[PDB]
Amino acid sequence: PEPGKCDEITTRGYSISMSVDKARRVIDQIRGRSYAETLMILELMPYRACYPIFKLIYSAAANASHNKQFNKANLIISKAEVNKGITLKKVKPRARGRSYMIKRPTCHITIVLRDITHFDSYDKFLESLTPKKLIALLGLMSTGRRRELLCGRFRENHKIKSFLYKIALFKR
Amino acid sequence: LKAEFEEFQRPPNQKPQLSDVLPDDFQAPEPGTPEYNDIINQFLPKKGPPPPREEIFAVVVIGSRQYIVIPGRWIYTQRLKGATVNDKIVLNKVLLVGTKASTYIGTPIVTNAAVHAVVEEQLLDDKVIVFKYKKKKNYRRNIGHRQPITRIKITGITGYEDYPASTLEA
Amino acid sequence: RKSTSASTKCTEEWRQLKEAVKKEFAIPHVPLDQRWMFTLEEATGPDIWNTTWYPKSADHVPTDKKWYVVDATDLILGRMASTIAIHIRGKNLASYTPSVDMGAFVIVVNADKVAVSGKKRTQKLYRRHSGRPGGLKEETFDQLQKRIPERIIEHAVRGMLPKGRLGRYLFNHLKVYKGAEHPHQAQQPIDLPLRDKRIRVEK
Amino acid sequence: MKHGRKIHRLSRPADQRRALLRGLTTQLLKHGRIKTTRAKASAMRKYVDKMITLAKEGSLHKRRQALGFIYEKQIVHALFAEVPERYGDRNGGYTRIIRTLPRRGDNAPMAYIELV
Amino acid sequence: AVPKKRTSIYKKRIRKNIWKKKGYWAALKAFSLAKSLSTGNSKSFFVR
Amino acid sequence: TRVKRGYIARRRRKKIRFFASSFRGAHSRLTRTIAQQKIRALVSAHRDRDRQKRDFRRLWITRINAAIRERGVYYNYSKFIHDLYKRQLLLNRKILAQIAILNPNCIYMIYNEIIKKED
RNA sequence: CGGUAGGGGAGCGUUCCGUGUUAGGGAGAAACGCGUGCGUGAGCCGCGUUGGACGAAGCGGAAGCGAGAAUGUCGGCUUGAGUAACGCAAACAUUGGUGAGAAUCCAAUGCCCCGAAAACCUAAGGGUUCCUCCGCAAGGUUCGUCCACGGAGGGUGAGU
RNA sequence: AGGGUGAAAAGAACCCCCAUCGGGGAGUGAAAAGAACAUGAAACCGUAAGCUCUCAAGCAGUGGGAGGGGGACCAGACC
Ligand SMILES: [Mg+2]
Ligand SMILES: [Mg+2]
Ligand SMILES: [Mg+2]
Ligand SMILES: [Mg+2]
Ligand SMILES: [Mg+2]
Ligand SMILES: [Mg+2]
Ligand SMILES: [Mg+2]
Ligand SMILES: [Mg+2]
Ligand SMILES: [Mg+2]
Ligand SMILES: [Mg+2]
Ligand SMILES: [Mg+2]
Ligand SMILES: [Mg+2]
Ligand SMILES: [Mg+2]
Ligand SMILES: [Mg+2]
Ligand SMILES: [Mg+2]
Ligand SMILES: [Mg+2]
Ligand SMILES: [Mg+2]
Ligand SMILES: [Mg+2]
Ligand SMILES: [Mg+2]
Ligand SMILES: [Mg+2]
Ligand SMILES: [Mg+2]
Ligand SMILES: [Mg+2]
Ligand SMILES: [Mg+2]
Ligand SMILES: [Mg+2]
Ligand SMILES: [Mg+2]
Ligand SMILES: [Mg+2]
Ligand SMILES: [Mg+2]
Ligand SMILES: [Mg+2]
Ligand SMILES: [Mg+2]
Ligand SMILES: [Mg+2]
Ligand SMILES: [Mg+2]
Ligand SMILES: [Mg+2]
Ligand SMILES: [Mg+2]
Ligand SMILES: [Mg+2]
Ligand SMILES: [Mg+2]
Ligand SMILES: [Mg+2]
Ligand SMILES: [Mg+2]
Ligand SMILES: [Mg+2]
Ligand SMILES: [Mg+2]
Ligand SMILES: [Mg+2]
Ligand SMILES: [Mg+2]
Ligand SMILES: [Mg+2]
Ligand SMILES: [Mg+2]
Ligand SMILES: [Mg+2]
Ligand SMILES: [Mg+2]
Ligand SMILES: [Mg+2]
Ligand SMILES: [Mg+2]
Ligand SMILES: [Mg+2]
Ligand SMILES: [Mg+2]
Ligand SMILES: [Mg+2]
Ligand SMILES: [Mg+2]
C-alpha cells in the first residue's frame, strides 16, 4: 500500500498550554533532525515550550520502540506540526470602564517519527542499478513483484514517480 | 501470488528483505543481449518515422478569413450552412499555392485550383462570456455566447499545375 | 561538496533518462534561415500556421545575435540614435516581437566626435536631480562631452528604447566607447546600415 | 556613554549594590562556595580579594577595616586565622568562577563562585 | 498612531518567520553546548 | 412556512470562487472581494477580446513592414500594400505576416511579381 | 436590438402542501465535494476510496422565498504583535529542606521597610474567605510543590 | 448562554511513555463513533508535493505565452 504504513509512528499531544507561535519556534528547529540530536537540543534550549515538546518526543520514541519495534538510533523526526487548540477567553478591567479580552491559547502537537533503515534492502539495491538496468530487471517480474519492489520510498526520493507511469511500468 | 506472498511477508514480518521479493534466480538479461533490447525497446520506444504528406500548401478563403492549409490536417472554421458530417466539399477560392519547388500566385485567385476537404464535424465553440458592465449605474449583464463551428479535414490540393508558376532562380 | 553516493548518482542518471525521452518525442527546432513552410514532423504538431508566430527559446538565444558598429564621427546625434534604437529593439527583423528580445548588439565608437546642429553644443542641457531640495544639477552638452562623453549617447539612446523590464535589459546591449577602438573584435562586428539621408553632416 | 567607567552596577542603586556585595562576601567566606548570577559573581571578585588581602597583613587596623565590611564578626576572626596558612604563597587570585546551566524561571545565566 | 490598514497575510508570515529564526541560532548554541558537556573535559562548566 | 436560506447562497458563492482560483492574495479568499474581482476579470476579458483584433493587425503590419524593408532601398509597407491592390491580390495581413516569417522566399517572389508587373 | 430613474414581457431557484403511505433509497437518501457535460442567465444534468436515512421528476398550490452594503445584528476568527504593558523608586541575599520540576513553597542566618502604622482590637459590612488533609484543569497579570482557588472533613460554648 | 458517542456503556482489562493530564498498542463495537465523541461549510492557523520571485513601481487582473511540471484518450487537446 503506502510508506506511511511502514515507517511511521504518529503521536499527538493534546492541549498543551504553549501558545501556538511559541511552540512553533521550537518545532521548526527539530524538523528533519535525528532523534539523538533533537534530544540533546531540547534538553538545553532556553525556551519553555521545549520541555513539553521534549516529553512528547521521548514518548513517541518509546512507541516506535515498544509497539512497532524500531531501533532508536534510526529515528528521525519526519513531519512535525502545531495546530491551534481550544482558546479560553477571560475578560479583564481596564482604565475608564473599558474592558479587554485575554486569550489563553492551547495547541495540539503532532510529531511523526520515521525510521530510515526500513526499506533499505530495496533502497540500496535499487540505487545499485543504472536507469536502463533497472527497467530491464523489471521486464521479468509480474505486476505483483513490480509493485512489491518499487513500493519503497524509492520513487519519491529520486523523483521518478510520474516517469514510471509513463513507461507503462505500472497500473493505477 | 507473488503479490499476495510478498505482501503477507511484508505484513507478518516487519522490515522486509530483498531476497524474498526478488529471488536470486534472476540475474537480469545482459546489456548487449537481444532479450535486453526487446524489453528496452518495449518500455523506451524510439520515436517513429513521420507519416508521408505531399509537400504543398494553399491559402484558401473560408467565411472570409484566409487559412493556410496543408493536407492531412484539420482546421476550424465558420459553420458551413447545410453541411453534414462526412461530406466532400471543394473550397474554390484559392489565393496561393506553394510547393518547395515552385509557387503559384493568383490574380486574385489561382484559376482552376480546388481544395478537396471533408467535413468531419459540427461543433459549438468554448463558451465565451460576454459581460456588460457599468460602474455605479448598477447594471450588469451576464451573457454567454457559444459560436457554431465547423471542423473540416483537408485531403488534397489540386488543379494548379497549368497556371503559370514563378520561382526564385539565382 | 558534490556527493558521489549511489543516491545522487542514481538521481542524475534518471534525470538524463527523462531528458532523453522528452528530447526524442518532442518536435525538432528548425531555425529561421531559408526555412520552408513545414517539416514532415511539425505537420503532426500544433497549429502554427493559422495562429500568429511567436518565438521560442531556441531563437533569441543571446549567443547568436548580430553585432554592429557605428562610427559616430560626423554623425548627427538624434538621427543616429533612432537607427540604433531600431536595431537594438529588433524592429528590422521579420521575426520581431514586442515581448521578446530579437534585437542586435550595437557598438558605438568615437563618441566624442558625434555632431550636433545649431547652437546646441552650448545650449542643450543635461540635468539630473539629487532627490534633496535644491538638488538640481545642470551641464551644458559640452562640459559633458569634455568630462565623460559616452554618457551623451547612452542617454540619447536610452530615451528611445522602451521603458520597463525589457527596456532596461535591452539597454545593456548598447556598448559605447570614446576611442576609435573597441575590444570586441572577437564578436566580428558588421557595420550598421543607415538609410537616412540627413544623418551625415558635412562642413 | 561610559568610556572607562569600570564598576559593576548589578542593576541596583548605590546603597543596595554596596549592601548586596557585602552580603555576598560574608556568604562566600561562611560557606566557601556559592551559586549566583554571572554578573553578581564577576562583580564580587574584587571585594572577596579585598578581604583576603586585608587578612594577609593582620594588623589591628586592617581587622577593623574588614570588620566594617563583612557583617558577621565570627567569619572575620576565622578569616584572619585561616588565611595566612591557606593563602600565604598565593599572590592574588583567590577566586574561581565556574558557570552552569541558566536558571529556569527567568533564564538568567548562573555561576558558581568558589573560594580557591 | 494606528494601523490605517490590516497587514496582508504574506507579509505577516515573513515577519513572524524572522522572529522564528532566532530559535535557530539558539538551537546552534544549545547543540554546541551539549557537545561540550558530553566530553566531560570542561573545568569552566559544571552540571549536577 | 419559515424558510432558512440554506445552501442557495453557499452554492452561488462557491461557483464564484471556482472562477477566481489563482488570484494572488485576498482576491482568492474572501467572498466579498472575490465577487468584485470576478466581475472585473469578466470585464477585461470582454474588453480585450476586442483589443485582440486590433493588436494582431498591429503586429502583423509591423512584421510585414520589417520583412519588406529589406529588399528595395526605397520600399515600405505603404508602397507594398498599394502595389498589392493595384495588382489585384487578395492576401490579407495575417497571411503575409505568417508567410513573411515561415516562408521568406515566398515573400521575395511575391515582391518580384509586383515589381515585374509595375515594370 | 447603449442605457439611469422608471414601465412592460418571459423565466429560474428555495421551503412547504396536493397527486403520495409516489418513483427511487444501508446494492448508500438528504447533504458535502467534484466536472474537457447542457443552458442567454438565474441554474440544470451527470459523478463520487466523503456521508449515514430519507425522498425526486412531472402537472399544480402557498409563502417567515433569493443579501455585499443598513456607523445593520449575533456568533466565530484575524490585524495591530509575540509589540505595549505586568499596578510605586521598602531590597533583597545565600545555605539547606520538600519535590518529576523552585528567582517565587518551608526553615535558618544575615540585610532592608513601617512603627499616631504597613501594629493590636472592636462597629458596620462580607458570608465560611477561618482550621486540617488532599489537588494543581480554570482563577493568580510570570512561576507555583503554594493560595483568600478547587475537593473532602471539622470549627463559633456566656445569669455578668 | 450551554441540545444530538453508540442499538447497547459494551465508557477501553493488560503492556509501554508515565508525578497527573495526555498518548501509542491491545481489547469492545457495523464503524474509534473514544467521551472537548454524530453531518462538519467559510473565515482563520498550518504541513507536504509541483512551478516560480531578491534591478523592482503594482486595484494585482486580462489578451498574447517563453521556459518547466502534471493526469490523458480523440494524444494538434485538457490542467
Ligand atoms: Mg472602576
Ligand atoms: Mg482596552
Ligand atoms: Mg444607481
Ligand atoms: Mg541612603
Ligand atoms: Mg534605599
Ligand atoms: Mg584595586
Ligand atoms: Mg422547516
Ligand atoms: Mg431570510
Ligand atoms: Mg492563470
Ligand atoms: Mg444600436
Ligand atoms: Mg436595451
Ligand atoms: Mg431599470
Ligand atoms: Mg428542484
Ligand atoms: Mg425541498
Ligand atoms: Mg416505498
Ligand atoms: Mg447521490
Ligand atoms: Mg429536505
Ligand atoms: Mg442539481
Ligand atoms: Mg427541475
Ligand atoms: Mg440507520
Ligand atoms: Mg413533487
Ligand atoms: Mg432540491
Ligand atoms: Mg420575514
Ligand atoms: Mg455579513
Ligand atoms: Mg468599526
Ligand atoms: Mg462582531
Ligand atoms: Mg494574533
Ligand atoms: Mg510596533
Ligand atoms: Mg520597542
Ligand atoms: Mg517593554
Ligand atoms: Mg496600563
Ligand atoms: Mg506588582
Ligand atoms: Mg525606619
Ligand atoms: Mg494588615
Ligand atoms: Mg488580626
Ligand atoms: Mg461585627
Ligand atoms: Mg468557597
Ligand atoms: Mg488558610
Ligand atoms: Mg494552575
Ligand atoms: Mg499561572
Ligand atoms: Mg508533589
Ligand atoms: Mg479551600
Ligand atoms: Mg488507552
Ligand atoms: Mg509529584
Ligand atoms: Mg490516560
Ligand atoms: Mg485496537
Ligand atoms: Mg472487532
Ligand atoms: Mg463532528
Ligand atoms: Mg538599473
Ligand atoms: Mg531578476
Ligand atoms: Mg514588481
PDB file of C-alpha atoms in Angstrom, chain A residues 2-166:
ATOM      1  CA  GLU A   2       1.870   3.089   1.330  1.00  0.00           C
ATOM      2  CA  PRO A   3       5.175   4.061   3.027  1.00  0.00           C
ATOM      3  CA  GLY A   4       3.048   5.888   5.589  1.00  0.00           C
ATOM      4  CA  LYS A   5       2.120   2.488   6.978  1.00  0.00           C
ATOM      5  CA  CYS A   6       5.592   1.013   7.419  1.00  0.00           C
ATOM      6  CA  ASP A   7       7.930   3.734   8.629  1.00  0.00           C
ATOM      7  CA  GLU A   8       5.766   5.887  10.756  1.00  0.00           C
ATOM      8  CA  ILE A   9       4.809   6.442  14.291  1.00  0.00           C
ATOM      9  CA  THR A  10       2.445   9.297  14.948  1.00  0.00           C
ATOM     10  CA  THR A  11       1.964  10.981  18.283  1.00  0.00           C
ATOM     11  CA  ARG A  12      -0.449  13.713  19.225  1.00  0.00           C
ATOM     12  CA  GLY A  13      -0.052  15.763  22.321  1.00  0.00           C
ATOM     13  CA  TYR A  14      -3.371  17.440  23.068  1.00  0.00           C
ATOM     14  CA  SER A  15      -3.990  20.704  24.801  1.00  0.00           C
ATOM     15  CA  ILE A  16      -0.521  21.854  25.669  1.00  0.00           C
ATOM     16  CA  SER A  17      -0.621  25.285  27.240  1.00  0.00           C
ATOM     17  CA  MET A  18       2.012  26.759  24.940  1.00  0.00           C
ATOM     18  CA  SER A  19       0.645  29.290  22.515  1.00  0.00           C
ATOM     19  CA  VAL A  20       0.956  28.034  19.002  1.00  0.00           C
ATOM     20  CA  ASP A  21       3.611  30.526  17.875  1.00  0.00           C
ATOM     21  CA  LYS A  22       5.999  29.943  20.752  1.00  0.00           C
ATOM     22  CA  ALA A  23       5.680  26.212  20.286  1.00  0.00           C
ATOM     23  CA  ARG A  24       6.355  26.629  16.612  1.00  0.00           C
ATOM     24  CA  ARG A  25       9.600  28.407  17.347  1.00  0.00           C
ATOM     25  CA  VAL A  26      10.964  25.157  18.773  1.00  0.00           C
ATOM     26  CA  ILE A  27       9.308  22.736  16.419  1.00  0.00           C
ATOM     27  CA  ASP A  28      10.770  24.407  13.320  1.00  0.00           C
ATOM     28  CA  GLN A  29      14.274  23.514  14.508  1.00  0.00           C
ATOM     29  CA  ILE A  30      13.754  19.848  15.236  1.00  0.00           C
ATOM     30  CA  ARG A  31      12.004  19.173  11.966  1.00  0.00           C
ATOM     31  CA  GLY A  32      14.180  16.774   9.966  1.00  0.00           C
ATOM     32  CA  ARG A  33      16.679  16.023  12.730  1.00  0.00           C
ATOM     33  CA  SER A  34      17.972  12.727  14.191  1.00  0.00           C
ATOM     34  CA  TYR A  35      16.296  11.638  17.360  1.00  0.00           C
ATOM     35  CA  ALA A  36      19.562  11.875  19.344  1.00  0.00           C
ATOM     36  CA  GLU A  37      20.461  15.437  18.309  1.00  0.00           C
ATOM     37  CA  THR A  38      16.885  16.514  18.903  1.00  0.00           C
ATOM     38  CA  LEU A  39      17.033  15.115  22.388  1.00  0.00           C
ATOM     39  CA  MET A  40      20.174  16.996  23.462  1.00  0.00           C
ATOM     40  CA  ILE A  41      18.979  20.223  21.868  1.00  0.00           C
ATOM     41  CA  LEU A  42      15.610  20.091  23.597  1.00  0.00           C
ATOM     42  CA  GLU A  43      17.395  19.440  26.847  1.00  0.00           C
ATOM     43  CA  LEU A  44      19.445  22.643  26.674  1.00  0.00           C
ATOM     44  CA  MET A  45      17.206  25.137  24.839  1.00  0.00           C
ATOM     45  CA  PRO A  46      16.240  28.364  26.604  1.00  0.00           C
ATOM     46  CA  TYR A  47      12.503  28.269  25.841  1.00  0.00           C
ATOM     47  CA  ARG A  48       9.687  26.968  27.989  1.00  0.00           C
ATOM     48  CA  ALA A  49       7.936  25.134  25.197  1.00  0.00           C
ATOM     49  CA  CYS A  50      10.899  22.802  24.727  1.00  0.00           C
ATOM     50  CA  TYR A  51      10.024  20.945  27.862  1.00  0.00           C
ATOM     51  CA  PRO A  52       6.554  19.684  26.858  1.00  0.00           C
ATOM     52  CA  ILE A  53       7.788  19.106  23.322  1.00  0.00           C
ATOM     53  CA  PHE A  54      10.549  17.034  24.878  1.00  0.00           C
ATOM     54  CA  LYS A  55       8.221  14.843  26.956  1.00  0.00           C
ATOM     55  CA  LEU A  56       6.295  14.313  23.784  1.00  0.00           C
ATOM     56  CA  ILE A  57       9.194  13.308  21.631  1.00  0.00           C
ATOM     57  CA  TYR A  58      10.583  10.941  24.181  1.00  0.00           C
ATOM     58  CA  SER A  59       7.171   9.306  24.345  1.00  0.00           C
ATOM     59  CA  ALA A  60       6.936   8.866  20.567  1.00  0.00           C
ATOM     60  CA  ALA A  61      10.347   7.198  20.791  1.00  0.00           C
ATOM     61  CA  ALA A  62       9.089   4.691  23.337  1.00  0.00           C
ATOM     62  CA  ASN A  63       6.175   3.995  20.976  1.00  0.00           C
ATOM     63  CA  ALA A  64       8.341   3.355  17.962  1.00  0.00           C
ATOM     64  CA  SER A  65      10.397   1.003  20.166  1.00  0.00           C
ATOM     65  CA  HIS A  66       7.784  -0.972  22.039  1.00  0.00           C
ATOM     66  CA  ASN A  67       4.869  -1.098  19.643  1.00  0.00           C
ATOM     67  CA  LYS A  68       6.138  -1.068  16.064  1.00  0.00           C
ATOM     68  CA  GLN A  69       9.590  -2.249  17.224  1.00  0.00           C
ATOM     69  CA  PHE A  70      12.031   0.285  15.802  1.00  0.00           C
ATOM     70  CA  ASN A  71      15.681   0.906  16.546  1.00  0.00           C
ATOM     71  CA  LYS A  72      16.002   4.235  18.403  1.00  0.00           C
ATOM     72  CA  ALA A  73      19.263   5.086  16.615  1.00  0.00           C
ATOM     73  CA  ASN A  74      17.484   5.179  13.250  1.00  0.00           C
ATOM     74  CA  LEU A  75      14.686   7.528  14.249  1.00  0.00           C
ATOM     75  CA  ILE A  76      14.451  10.913  12.598  1.00  0.00           C
ATOM     76  CA  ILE A  77      11.614  13.400  13.002  1.00  0.00           C
ATOM     77  CA  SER A  78       9.977  13.357   9.605  1.00  0.00           C
ATOM     78  CA  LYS A  79       6.976  15.547   9.986  1.00  0.00           C
ATOM     79  CA  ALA A  80       6.065  17.784  12.881  1.00  0.00           C
ATOM     80  CA  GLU A  81       3.383  20.406  13.144  1.00  0.00           C
ATOM     81  CA  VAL A  82       1.466  22.526  15.581  1.00  0.00           C
ATOM     82  CA  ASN A  83      -2.202  23.415  15.269  1.00  0.00           C
ATOM     83  CA  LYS A  84      -4.410  25.710  17.328  1.00  0.00           C
ATOM     84  CA  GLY A  85      -6.347  24.265  20.239  1.00  0.00           C
ATOM     85  CA  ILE A  86      -9.312  25.387  22.320  1.00  0.00           C
ATOM     86  CA  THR A  87      -8.917  29.034  23.312  1.00  0.00           C
ATOM     87  CA  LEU A  88     -10.175  30.128  26.702  1.00  0.00           C
ATOM     88  CA  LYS A  89     -11.237  33.746  26.921  1.00  0.00           C
ATOM     89  CA  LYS A  90     -11.296  35.880  30.060  1.00  0.00           C
ATOM     90  CA  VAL A  91     -12.340  39.464  30.483  1.00  0.00           C
ATOM     91  CA  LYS A  92     -10.284  41.912  32.469  1.00  0.00           C
ATOM     92  CA  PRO A  93     -10.986  45.512  33.504  1.00  0.00           C
ATOM     93  CA  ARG A  94      -9.066  48.440  32.125  1.00  0.00           C
ATOM     94  CA  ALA A  95      -8.805  52.211  32.685  1.00  0.00           C
ATOM     95  CA  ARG A  96     -12.066  54.159  32.494  1.00  0.00           C
ATOM     96  CA  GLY A  97     -14.566  51.334  32.240  1.00  0.00           C
ATOM     97  CA  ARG A  98     -13.246  49.783  29.059  1.00  0.00           C
ATOM     98  CA  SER A  99     -12.663  46.022  29.199  1.00  0.00           C
ATOM     99  CA  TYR A 100     -10.378  43.729  27.277  1.00  0.00           C
ATOM    100  CA  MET A 101     -10.039  40.147  26.215  1.00  0.00           C
ATOM    101  CA  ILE A 102      -7.326  37.784  27.256  1.00  0.00           C
ATOM    102  CA  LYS A 103      -6.936  34.531  25.380  1.00  0.00           C
ATOM    103  CA  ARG A 104      -5.071  31.615  26.924  1.00  0.00           C
ATOM    104  CA  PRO A 105      -4.211  29.620  23.812  1.00  0.00           C
ATOM    105  CA  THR A 106      -3.586  25.919  23.697  1.00  0.00           C
ATOM    106  CA  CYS A 107      -2.282  23.720  20.901  1.00  0.00           C
ATOM    107  CA  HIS A 108      -2.045  20.229  19.531  1.00  0.00           C
ATOM    108  CA  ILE A 109       1.309  18.995  18.514  1.00  0.00           C
ATOM    109  CA  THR A 110       1.788  16.212  16.089  1.00  0.00           C
ATOM    110  CA  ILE A 111       5.152  14.533  15.804  1.00  0.00           C
ATOM    111  CA  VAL A 112       5.735  11.918  13.176  1.00  0.00           C
ATOM    112  CA  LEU A 113       8.767   9.717  13.625  1.00  0.00           C
ATOM    113  CA  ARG A 114      10.153   7.878  10.648  1.00  0.00           C
ATOM    114  CA  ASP A 115      12.616   5.028  10.510  1.00  0.00           C
ATOM    115  CA  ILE A 116      15.312   5.421   7.835  1.00  0.00           C
ATOM    116  CA  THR A 117      16.624   1.859   7.636  1.00  0.00           C
ATOM    117  CA  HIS A 118      13.226   0.278   6.992  1.00  0.00           C
ATOM    118  CA  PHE A 119      13.075  -0.335   3.191  1.00  0.00           C
ATOM    119  CA  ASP A 120      16.898  -0.112   2.951  1.00  0.00           C
ATOM    120  CA  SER A 121      17.157  -3.501   1.239  1.00  0.00           C
ATOM    121  CA  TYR A 122      15.102  -2.353  -1.727  1.00  0.00           C
ATOM    122  CA  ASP A 123      16.705   1.081  -1.329  1.00  0.00           C
ATOM    123  CA  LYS A 124      20.398   0.296  -1.719  1.00  0.00           C
ATOM    124  CA  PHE A 125      19.684  -2.453  -4.211  1.00  0.00           C
ATOM    125  CA  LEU A 126      17.754  -0.037  -6.437  1.00  0.00           C
ATOM    126  CA  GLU A 127      20.493   2.573  -6.033  1.00  0.00           C
ATOM    127  CA  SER A 128      22.887  -0.084  -7.273  1.00  0.00           C
ATOM    128  CA  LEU A 129      21.122  -0.083 -10.642  1.00  0.00           C
ATOM    129  CA  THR A 130      21.593   2.296 -13.584  1.00  0.00           C
ATOM    130  CA  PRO A 131      18.318   3.512 -15.174  1.00  0.00           C
ATOM    131  CA  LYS A 132      18.422   1.034 -18.053  1.00  0.00           C
ATOM    132  CA  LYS A 133      19.488  -1.906 -15.871  1.00  0.00           C
ATOM    133  CA  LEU A 134      16.501  -1.370 -13.583  1.00  0.00           C
ATOM    134  CA  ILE A 135      13.950  -1.331 -16.410  1.00  0.00           C
ATOM    135  CA  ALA A 136      15.490  -4.495 -17.857  1.00  0.00           C
ATOM    136  CA  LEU A 137      15.272  -6.101 -14.403  1.00  0.00           C
ATOM    137  CA  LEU A 138      11.591  -5.226 -14.086  1.00  0.00           C
ATOM    138  CA  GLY A 139      10.922  -6.624 -17.550  1.00  0.00           C
ATOM    139  CA  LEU A 140      10.709 -10.078 -15.972  1.00  0.00           C
ATOM    140  CA  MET A 141       8.683  -9.908 -12.807  1.00  0.00           C
ATOM    141  CA  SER A 142       4.908  -9.980 -12.620  1.00  0.00           C
ATOM    142  CA  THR A 143       2.800  -6.950 -11.830  1.00  0.00           C
ATOM    143  CA  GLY A 144       2.828  -8.276  -8.261  1.00  0.00           C
ATOM    144  CA  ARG A 145       6.599  -8.219  -7.852  1.00  0.00           C
ATOM    145  CA  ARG A 146       6.959  -4.863  -9.647  1.00  0.00           C
ATOM    146  CA  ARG A 147       4.554  -3.293  -7.209  1.00  0.00           C
ATOM    147  CA  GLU A 148       6.302  -5.032  -4.314  1.00  0.00           C
ATOM    148  CA  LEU A 149       9.748  -3.797  -5.285  1.00  0.00           C
ATOM    149  CA  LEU A 150       9.050  -0.180  -6.059  1.00  0.00           C
ATOM    150  CA  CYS A 151       6.761   0.321  -3.075  1.00  0.00           C
ATOM    151  CA  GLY A 152       9.663   1.727  -1.105  1.00  0.00           C
ATOM    152  CA  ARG A 153      10.467   5.391  -0.595  1.00  0.00           C
ATOM    153  CA  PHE A 154      12.488   4.962  -3.771  1.00  0.00           C
ATOM    154  CA  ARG A 155      10.223   6.529  -6.426  1.00  0.00           C
ATOM    155  CA  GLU A 156       9.777   9.728  -4.414  1.00  0.00           C
ATOM    156  CA  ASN A 157      13.324  10.453  -3.301  1.00  0.00           C
ATOM    157  CA  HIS A 158      14.704  10.385  -6.832  1.00  0.00           C
ATOM    158  CA  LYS A 159      11.542  11.851  -8.367  1.00  0.00           C
ATOM    159  CA  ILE A 160      10.686   9.005 -10.705  1.00  0.00           C
ATOM    160  CA  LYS A 161       7.022   8.798  -9.857  1.00  0.00           C
ATOM    161  CA  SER A 162       5.372  10.311 -12.961  1.00  0.00           C
ATOM    162  CA  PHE A 163       8.075   8.838 -15.146  1.00  0.00           C
ATOM    163  CA  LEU A 164       7.379   5.165 -14.437  1.00  0.00           C
ATOM    164  CA  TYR A 165       3.658   5.575 -15.052  1.00  0.00           C
ATOM    165  CA  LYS A 166       4.622   6.921 -18.492  1.00  0.00           C
TER     166      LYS A 166
END
